[PDB]
């Protein structure tokens, strides 16, 4: 599962 990265 991907790590969250905000935009």
């Amino acid at each position: 599962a991907e790590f969250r990265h905000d935009s």
Partner: antibody
């Protein structure tokens, strides 16, 4: 920007580890940086444990996740870690690492600052 | 999980020589957002780890241009063009695309004799 970890130094097996990371030179609230805990067990390399985002969303390393609880206090500018049921293998240096970013480019983030760490030795 | 395999694990060098460390991920670490969260960290003896390179090839502020990162997908290389005494220590590659975030085992760049 400085990061300062605090922890008990020594614990007996089965106790709960409570760590604190305190930040200076900036505001967790304003910056919205994510924060991780990483450890370095005796004679090994680095291992990521847990991460907490500005909105209290959290991610853990499955290898230890069941024993870990990360939290934060924005009013105090601090991030915390609890590790339950400590044993010999938790003997390590515990690092606080800030996931800072370039400007307002939230997506261009990386561990830009690390604390000096706090060492724990677990023994009966 | 993403295994991060560094080669070699031990790298003796003479100061002034070039050095190269390979890092292979066990699967693509290209994130869906389009970035490849490949980072290099250096831990000098008796010191905290520090950021050298992020997004494969971008030097962090204050990191000198003798360091260069390259590669893509699963295949990554850190080069150091003329090794100085301050460069010695343990180098870790690191992926922050998939959970758990994983480090390589560490490559110990040391003074050769």
């Amino acid at each position: 920007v400085t990061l300062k970890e605090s922890g008990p130094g020594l614990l007996k097996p089965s106790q709960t580890l409570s760590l604190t990371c305190s930040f200076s030179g900036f505001s967790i609230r304003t910056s919205k940086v994510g924060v991780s805990w990483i450890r370095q067990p005796s004679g090994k390399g680095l291992e990521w444990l847990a991460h907490i985002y500005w909105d209290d969303d959290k991610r853990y390393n499955p290898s230890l996740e069941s024993r870990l609880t990360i939290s934060k206090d924005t009013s105090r500018d601090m991030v915390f870690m609890k590790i339950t049921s400590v044993d010999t293998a938790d003997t390590a240096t515990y690092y606080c690492a800030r996931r800072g970013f370039y400007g307002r480019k939230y997506e261009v983030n990386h561990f830009d600052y690390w604390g000096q760490g706090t060492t724990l030795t677990v023994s009966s | 999980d993403v295994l991060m395999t560094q080669t070699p694990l031990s790298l003796p060098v003479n100061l002034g020589e070039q050095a190269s460390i390979s890092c292979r991920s066990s699967q693509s670490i290209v994130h869906s957002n389009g970035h490849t969260y490949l980072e290099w960290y250096l831990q000098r003896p008796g010191q905290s780890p520090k950021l050298l390179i992020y997004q494969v090839s971008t030097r962090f502020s204050g990191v000198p241009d003798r360091f260069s990162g390259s590669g893509s997908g699963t295949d990554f290389t850190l080069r150091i063009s003329r090794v100085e005494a301050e460069d010695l220590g343990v180098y870790y590659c690191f992926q922050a695309s998939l959970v758990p975030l994983t480090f390589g085992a560490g490559t110990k760049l040391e003074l050769k004799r």
